[PDB]
């Protein structure tokens, strides 16, 4: 069922307030299972699931609950909103995380209608061909795309100075020395940046920045590949 994955790509990353840790992931749920991809910037993870295991794992955790194999994912799907949705939440849905040799358990455990709604995540070490299509490749295109964005944008900044010329080359002094801006010298600006902004701009932190101001692009790129 390669149907699942297909959607996992578009779905951008996000942040997740884990009980102790914190990792940016992406999940895609359907009526026939889900395909969650998580990572902590040090190593990716992934877990595929189909209706079968869903209901199976269901009673193995939500024993007091007897829910239809397909419907479960449907409800759980609506529960997972502490990412895309408001950064607030998720009520009492404290995400427990533990690691054990390529294994990563995302013991959700929240509330449902006022009852103890449980659910775990058996995400194994993500595969190469996978990481390549979610981090490496896609993201790589971003940096390669942003660079091309700076040049065309900065070069357009040159036209601003070029126009200012005719105004200045003919008296007509500005009305406020305030707006008066120094001529944009691509070489200059680009050398100081690596000594002022970059030092804290490159800071990947824990991936949080990545999600808060890049997905807008990320999605528009990863999708542009299969087209």
């Amino acid at each position: 069922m390669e149907e699942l994955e297909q959607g996992l790509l578009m779905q951008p990353w996000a942040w997740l307030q884990l009980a102790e840790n914190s990792l940016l992931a992406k999940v895609f749920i359907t009526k026939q299972g889900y395909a969650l991809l998580v990572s902590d910037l040090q190593q990716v993870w992934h877990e595929q699931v189909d209706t079968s295991v869903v209901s199976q794992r269901a009673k193995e955790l939500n024993k007091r609950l007897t829910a239809p194999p397909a419907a479960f994912l449907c409800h759980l799907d609506n529960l997972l909103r502490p990412l895309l949705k408001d950064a607030a939440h998720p009520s009492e849905a404290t995400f427990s995380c533990d690691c054990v040799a390529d294994a990563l358990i995302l013991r959700v455990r929240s509330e449902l209608s006022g009852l103890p709604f449980y659910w775990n995540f058996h995400c194994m070490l993500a595969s190469p061909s996978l990481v390549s299509q979610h981090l490496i490749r896609p993201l790589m295109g971003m940096s390669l795309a942003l660079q091309c964005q700076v040049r065309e944008l900065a070069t357009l900044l040159h036209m601003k100075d070029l126009e200012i010329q005719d105004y200045q080359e003919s008296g007509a002094t500005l009305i406020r020395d305030r707006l008066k801006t120094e001529p944009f010298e691509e070489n200059s600006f680009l050398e100081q940046f690596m000594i002022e902004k970059l030092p804290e701009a490159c800071s990947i932190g824990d991936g949080k920045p990545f999600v808060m101001n890049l997905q807008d692009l990320y999605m528009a790129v990863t999708t542009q590949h299969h087209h």
Partner: protein, 152 residues
Amino acid sequence: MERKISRIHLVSEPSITHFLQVSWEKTLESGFVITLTDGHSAWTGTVSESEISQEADDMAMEKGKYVGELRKALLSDVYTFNFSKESCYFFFEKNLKDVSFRLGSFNLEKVENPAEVIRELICYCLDTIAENQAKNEHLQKENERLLRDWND
């Protein structure tokens, strides 16, 4: 043993109403005396303490709001009851969109002596209804008389 009536509805007989009294002693955790009837036969069960403590833990529910839930599933769409005669087990789950789930359920034992049971209930159930008139009229007239007062 302060009682409590409230009528339930079994899916085992989606039409013929039922009744489930629950006489508790002060606290609800301590236990109580739940009983099922139908105007002809009865089924009494006794879920005291020690059996309730192992429910929110066996059902993962939090005791902080568990005992409270029992108050809306044993004395009033949510919450459904399913009890089969020969099964002699009062199975009930918390109904909700998509699905629902068990909450405990005791093995309500029948009663070879319906008469007395079906009676004791009505014998006392005539207060919450009739004896309520003693407090109903005391406000139906006292308040309908105070009228001319606020217009003085």
